[PDB]
Amino acid sequence: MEIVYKPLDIRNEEQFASIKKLIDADLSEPYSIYVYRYFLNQWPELTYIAVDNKSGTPNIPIGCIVCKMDPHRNVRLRGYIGMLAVESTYRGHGIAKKLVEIAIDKMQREHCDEIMLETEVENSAALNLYEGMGFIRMKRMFRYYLNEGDAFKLILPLT
Amino acid sequence: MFHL
Amino acid sequence: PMEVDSILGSLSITDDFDQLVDVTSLFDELCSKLKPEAIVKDPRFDLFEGTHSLEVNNSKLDSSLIELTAEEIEFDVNVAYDPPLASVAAIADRLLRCVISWLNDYQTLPTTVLSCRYTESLLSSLVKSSWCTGNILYDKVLGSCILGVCYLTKFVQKLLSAGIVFEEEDLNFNNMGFNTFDNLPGQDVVINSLTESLQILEAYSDDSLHLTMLKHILKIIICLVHLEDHLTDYSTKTSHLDELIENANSVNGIFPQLQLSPPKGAFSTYIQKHRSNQFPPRKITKLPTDYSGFITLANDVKTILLVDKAESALETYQFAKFFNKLEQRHVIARILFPLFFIRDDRTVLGKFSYTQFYLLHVKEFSAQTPGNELIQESSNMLLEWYQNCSQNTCRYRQGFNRQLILWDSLQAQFESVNSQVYCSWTYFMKLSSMIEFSLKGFDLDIYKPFEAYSMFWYVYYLSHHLETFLKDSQNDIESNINAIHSMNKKLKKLKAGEKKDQLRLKYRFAMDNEMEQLQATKQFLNYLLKEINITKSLCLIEVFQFAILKSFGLIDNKNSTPSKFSNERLIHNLRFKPFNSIGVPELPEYEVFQQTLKDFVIEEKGAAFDIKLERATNFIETEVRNVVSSIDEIMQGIKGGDNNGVLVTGTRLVQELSLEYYCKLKHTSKALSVNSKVIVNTLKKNIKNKDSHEYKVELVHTTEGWNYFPIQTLRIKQDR
Amino acid sequence: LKLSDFIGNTLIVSLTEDRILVGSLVAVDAQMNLLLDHVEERMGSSSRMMGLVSVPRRSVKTIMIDKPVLQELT
Ligand SMILES: CC(C)(COP(=O)(O)OP(=O)(O)OC[C@H]1O[C@@H](n2cnc3c(N)ncnc32)[C@H](O)[C@@H]1OP(=O)(O)O)[C@@H](O)C(=O)NCCC(=O)NCCS
Ligand SMILES: [Cl-]
Ligand SMILES: [Cl-]
Ligand SMILES: [Cl-]
Ligand SMILES: [Cl-]
Ligand SMILES: [Cl-]
Ligand SMILES: [Cl-]
Numbered sequence: 001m002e003i004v005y006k007p008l009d010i011r012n013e014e015q016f017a018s019i020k021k022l023i024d025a026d027l028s029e030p031y032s033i034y035v036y037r038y039f040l041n042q043w044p045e046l047t048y049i050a051v052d053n054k055s056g057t058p059n060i061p062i063g064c065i066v067c068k069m070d071p072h073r074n075v076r077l078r079g080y081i082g083m084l085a086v087e088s089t090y091r092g093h094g095i096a097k098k099l100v101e102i103a104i105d106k107m108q109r110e111h112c113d114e115i116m117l118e119t120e121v122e123n124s125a126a127l128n129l130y131e132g133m134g135f136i137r138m139k140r141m142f143r144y145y146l147n148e149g150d151a152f153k154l155i156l157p158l159t
Numbered sequence: 160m161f162h163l
Numbered sequence: 164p165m166e167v168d169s170i171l172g173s174l175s176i177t178d179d180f181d182q183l184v185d186v187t188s189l190f191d192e193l194c195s196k197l198k199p200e201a202i203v204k205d206p207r208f209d210l211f212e213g214t215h216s217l218e219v220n221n222s223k224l225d226s227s228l229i230e231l232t233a234e235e236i237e238f239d240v241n242v243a244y245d246p247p248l249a250s251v252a253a254i255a256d257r258l259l260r261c262v263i264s265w266l267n268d269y270q271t272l273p274t275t276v277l278s279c280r281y282t283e284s285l286l287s288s289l290v291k292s293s294w295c296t297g298n299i300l301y302d303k304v305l306g307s308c309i310l311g312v313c314y315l316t317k318f319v320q321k322l323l324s325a326g327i328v329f330e331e332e333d334l335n336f337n338n339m340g341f342n343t344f345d346n347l348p349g350q351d352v353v354i355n356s357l358t359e360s361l362q363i364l365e366a367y368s369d370d371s372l373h374l375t376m377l378k379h380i381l382k383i384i385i386c387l388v389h390l391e392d393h394l395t396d397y398s399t400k401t402s403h404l405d406e407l408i409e410n411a412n413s414v415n416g417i418f419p420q421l422q423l424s425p426p427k428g429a430f431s432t433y434i435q436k437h438r439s440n441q442f443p444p445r446k447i448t449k450l451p452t453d454y455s456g457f458i459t460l461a462n463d464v465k466t467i468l469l470v471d472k473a474e475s476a477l478e479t480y481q482f483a484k485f486f487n488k489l490e491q492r493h494v495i496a497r498i499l500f501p502l503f504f505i506r507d508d509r510t511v512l513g514k515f516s517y518t519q520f521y522l523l524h525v526k527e528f529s530a531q532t533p534g535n536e537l538i539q540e541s542s543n544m545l546l547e548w549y550q551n552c553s554q555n556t557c558r559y560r561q562g563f564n565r566q567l568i569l570w571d572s573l574q575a576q577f578e579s580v581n582s583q584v585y586c587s588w589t590y591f592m593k594l595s596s597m598i599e600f601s602l603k604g605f606d607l608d609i610y611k612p613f614e615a616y617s618m619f620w621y622v623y624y625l626s627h628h629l630e631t632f633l634k635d636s637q638n639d640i641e642s643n644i645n646a647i648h649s650m651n652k653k654l655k656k657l658k659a660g661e662k663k664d665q666l667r668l669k670y671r672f673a674m675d676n677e678m679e680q681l682q683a684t685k686q687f688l689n690y691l692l693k694e695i696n697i698t699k700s701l702c703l704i705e706v707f708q709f710a711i712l713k714s715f716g717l718i719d720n721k722n723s724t725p726s727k728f729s730n731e732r733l734i735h736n737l738r739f740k741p742f743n744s745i746g747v748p749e750l751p752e753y754e755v756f757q758q759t760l761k762d763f764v765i766e767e768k769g770a771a772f773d774i775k776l777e778r779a780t781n782f783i784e785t786e787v788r789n790v791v792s793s794i795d796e797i798m799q800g801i802k803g804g805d806n807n808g809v810l811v812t813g814t815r816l817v818q819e820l821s822l823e824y825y826c827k828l829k830h831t832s833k834a835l836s837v838n839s840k841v842i843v844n845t846l847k848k849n850i851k852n853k854d855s856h857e858y859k860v861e862l863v864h865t866t867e868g869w870n871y872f873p874i875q876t877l878r879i880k881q882d883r
Numbered sequence: 884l885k886l887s888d889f890i891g892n893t894l895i896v897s898l899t900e901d902r903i904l905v906g907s908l909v910a911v912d913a914q915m916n917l918l919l920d921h922v923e924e925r926m927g928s929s930s931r932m933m934g935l936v937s938v939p940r941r942s943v944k945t946i947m948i949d950k951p952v953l954q955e956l957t
Contacts, residue, residue: 010200013914029162030223030443032937034213034910034918041202041912042210082161092883104728119160121608131611132724136734140607142557143269143332145162147448150557157733163215172928176903182950183895190946193886194915203886204910204918213910213918216937219898226933227902227924441934 002054003062003095005102008040008047016040018061019049026085028148036066039082043068045110046079048102050086050095062087065099069112079107081117084126097129104133104156113159121150130154217443224443229436231428238428240284240294243301251300252373253423254281255308255380257430262312262387263456266319266494270448271335273440276316278430278447283438285309289346299363304377307353307360311384314353317343318391322498333555334494339438350388357385372421379410379417383457386410390464390495394502397513399468407461411454418453463496467503469816471512476523477687477813479504479512483552485817487559489824497553505546517542525588530640530677530684537580541573541589548592560607563600564741567593571745587636590747594629597742598622598698602871605862612860614738615875616713616720617756619705621739626699628748630692637688644681647673687811690797697793697828700786701872704835707779708875710763711839714776715846717877718860720760780839787836794829798822824869831868838874845877856880886911888956894919895947896938902926904936915940 009015020036040047050063063086072078081103086096104115118141119126131137135154144151177183197203204210218224244250258279265275276282284293285306292306316338323336330336348356361381364374386407392398435444466486473479487497506513511520518534521542526532544566551562570593577586601622604610610618650670657663712718721731732753736743742750751759765775800810801821814821849855857880862873889908896904896917906922917938924933 013199027160029160030221031161032214032216032218032221032224033916033939034210034216034937035161035163037202037912037916038210038214041200044200084160101727108728118162132722132726134722134726134729134734136611136614136738137609138737139561140557140609141332142555151162155737157729157737159733161214166928169927169929176925177895180895180949183947184950184953185945185947186889186894187943187945187947189884190886190911190915193884194911194913197886197913199913202910202912203890205890208909210910213935213937216918216935217933218937218939219902219904220939220942227926437929437931439932441932 001052001093003093003098004051004053005098006049006051008044008049008064010040010044015049015059015061019047019064019066022061022064022087023066023083023085026088027083028145039066039068046103046106048099048106050090050099052090062090063095063099065096065103067103067107069107069110072114072116076113077111079104079110079112079115081115097133100129100133104158108158113157115156115158117154118144118151119154120145120148121152122148127152127154130156217441226435226440226442226444229432229444231431231433231436234427235431235433236428238280238426238431238433240280241296243296243298244426247298247300248369248371248377249373249423250426251305252377252380253425254279254305254429255377256423257425257450258282258308258312259380259383259454259457260450261430262315263451263454264448266334267456267459268448268451269333269335269494271445272316272337273339273435273442274445274447276312277339277341277434278432279309280429280431280433281305281309282313283434285313286341286343289343290341304360304363304381307356308381308384310348310353311357311388313343314347314350315384315387315390317347319495322394322495322502325498325502327498327501327550328494328554329558333497333558337442339434339440350391353388354385357381357388361385372417373423376414376417376421379414382410383407383414383454386461393464393468393499397471397503397506399471401465401468404461404465408458411457411461414454460493460495463493464499466492467496467500470500470504473512473816475813476520476527477811478816479520479549480524481813481821482816483549485814485820485824487553489820489827491556492553497555500553501550504549511546517546521545525585526680527684527687528588528591529584529636530643530680531584533584537573537576537582537585541585544569544573545592548596557607560600560603560609563596563603566596567600567741568744570596575746587632590632591629593745594625594632594748597745598625598629600741601625602698605873606870608862610738610862611722612862612875613718613720613722615862616706616709616760617735617738619702619709620756620759621742621751623699623702623706624751625748626695626702630695630699633688633691633695637685637692640681640685640688643677644685647678647681682808683805683811686805686809687813690800690810690812693793693797693810697790697797700790700793701832701835704783704786704790705872705875706763707783708835708839708842710760710765711776711779711842712860712875712877713760714765714772715850717846717858720756776843780843783839784836787832790832791829794825794832798825801825827867828869828872831865831872831874834865834868834874835872838876842877884957889948892948892952892956895949897944897947898938899942899944904933904938906933906936909935915943917943917946 020033024031046067046069048065049061051059052062065081066083067079067081069077069079081100084096084099107115117130119130121140131154133156135156137152138155139153141151141153202210220228222228258276261275261278264270265272281294287293292302294301296302320336323330323334328334361378364378364381367374386403389403432444432447470479470482473482486492486500505511510516515523518538521538524545548566551559551566554562570589574586574589574593577589601618604618647670650666650673654663654666654670657666709718713720722734735753735756739750765772767775797810800807801812801814801818805811805813805815812821858877859880860875860877863876864870864873890910891907893905894908896919898904903925904919904922905925906919908917909920910918918935919938920935922933922936924931
């Protein structure tokens, strides 16, 4: 298994469609097509995909992470991780971890002071991933995901 | 994840 | 399809527009001309505003693609489905359990109350009964039932219009554009309609299980219409609240005997597919199986009305500190409390003004008596503190973020004017809220196990400053009591004369106007010192437990997993960001946290390690018993009352809840000592095993313990 | 006739299977995906409002604009 991590090619639309195809299977909150075009078209450099070079389909995205950055309050830039998903047959191989690393490293190159994200309290897989990278819980939102459960606001300070 |  | 009006209506869809030009060929070639990355839009428009968009032909986001059964489409409000008595009861039963799922289970309004085709029918005619079935049960009996629940939701709307709690997380009110204006009848009409339909059931000669349940259902709906009385008239009467409990208890035993099946399509997702809807389709959540939610709702509202019986500022203070602490109250009661406490005539409980109510808290805490902007701003600050107590378990801690920086600003403004009596009370409220805000994070699983030492020692650090402030306040009050006592000593030595009359005149004046409050505050400060030392000792036990865990090498005060992005100092400052602008007590430096930990951590080895470890465990087991003794003393004074003369707790309104709080606090105390024995016995034996186990520390909530102090339990690490 | 002229104007977008959407155009991309606001969904006799709706390219059958509105755009 040979995994290659690529920055999003905005002109590649079949790659764009496979990103939505993958994210939509593993999300609880459904996203319209303009949810994706809000992230990818405005922040193309902050979306990465993972492909398997030795697989039968080399360029198909088996995993991807989608991020954005905006100035928080007035004096700080806050990077945001909105979407992260890995194919079900590829989990447990460190793929998502390296996708988060290459995303936070990119946002750190773009002079982000912090990375923020929300996730369910019941998502033990995602919590161990982020908190193991230095994230800490700053907030608990009551029924943020409705009947899915409460949420944790995670922040990783960079500067 | 992202939730509106 | 085969409907006549849909056929002719297809011609009228374009009638409003006089001329139409096809632009599809133009759009395709122009969009084909654009670069793939570009999006044509109004430059003013923010693309984030398009994230709440729906998508057509997307099953998860298109309301038009909802699949319905034939019965759900064909349901007619005017058809009286057989059997009438059994179906009306089954329909009415579903509606009340829909009310519970909406309010108790935090479900959306379109899924529960508005899913009923009869509810949508009654509200639709009011905007301009609604159905005439030809049967007395559907037309009048059910027509009264639908009106009662519709009147209930209108009152729920007015509770949400007060802005007390947060919409769509504490309570959903998505009515799909339903505005009944003033067309909805008043309370008198709704109750009489339910009473007239009730007397029809009484006059019925037949007797059945379905009739008996319907008898109670109309009675329950009558009680829900009477919930408005606690707001409009502020009545403390538990009459209708006792009926609602008793009728629900009678119904819960009837559910096993009968089985109810409503007409197919009576309750469906039909309203989402045809009425104006700007939200994605949503399935109908599973409904409750009993009427226990009505009992919980009625008990919580009964508790809210207890605060009207308060006579002192301490009784209102302790009520807010206990009514919503043990478990989150019903959202109806959590909204009703700030509206019942802070009333329409700008008075607190109808007895005190905003400034009077604040001056009570300072008088009863400082035992001293003296309308500017500082007092006015502090009075508004105190009321927002009361209103935060009724928030949910998450918003409760979030409310302190605003309070801590505002209390500190308020205290600094008092110090600039050198008004030290008010400055001290503001400092007490601030430092109390700092401790509360910090210990609440353990209840919400905010802190990870490696951050346990940082937070537990910080609260201990804060608790040491609060005990110091409280003990000096009691010393200042003690000297005032002795000053009055010394006058009595001096009067006995004095011969009868004019100067003895001056001292006798001032002794009685101080004895009649100052002595009683100084005694009551002295006993109240005894309770505060006992509670803060209990809270202080528990934090120290948690710090000693963490140090033992680090001494064995199981946990560190930082993240053990390496990462190439951040550092410990940045993460530590982020954790303590809210306490950064507070000058007194000053937030300890990052180095003070580190150096203090090394004082507790045992770096010795062998026999020297075993000696220092025994002193640490011996403190845990000893201090736990000393905490149990202090908790036991408090529980006796709460049972005995405040007029005993030793302690003053002001827990008369929340006696049972306060006793339950300390009993849970006593369980955690005993649990902390038991766990320290397990940790020592496990890790000592584990050192002997060269191929020992690999452990990880987890913050565990004791079920019947107090969750502000979780047990640092170690568990075997197994791979997935 | 640039696409920027059409935004903010009411478009009559007929969906692929007997559905009519009437709403103001907010955004359009290179793949011809439409974002409409104040959408009114008309099918047969019934009618309802849907707020902000997104229409993919495949779902569209035809797009039409009122002729008086079109001439004031120029
Ligand atoms: C989160 C997710 C992408 C992980 O995929 P993955 O390729 O297996 O990620 P990784 O293999 O790199 O895991 C790295 C770390 O995360 C943690 N982790 C990963 N999978 C875990 C699991 N099933 N259970 C507990 N922890 C897990 C572990 O700490 C792991 O480190 P370790 O292997 O040393 O124990 C996958 O679970 C998923 O698709 N979740 C749904 C999408 C989502 O909710 N994302 C987060 C919302 S922002
Ligand atoms: Cl592809
Ligand atoms: Cl039904
Ligand atoms: Cl007080
Ligand atoms: Cl008092
Ligand atoms: Cl003053
Ligand atoms: Cl406490």
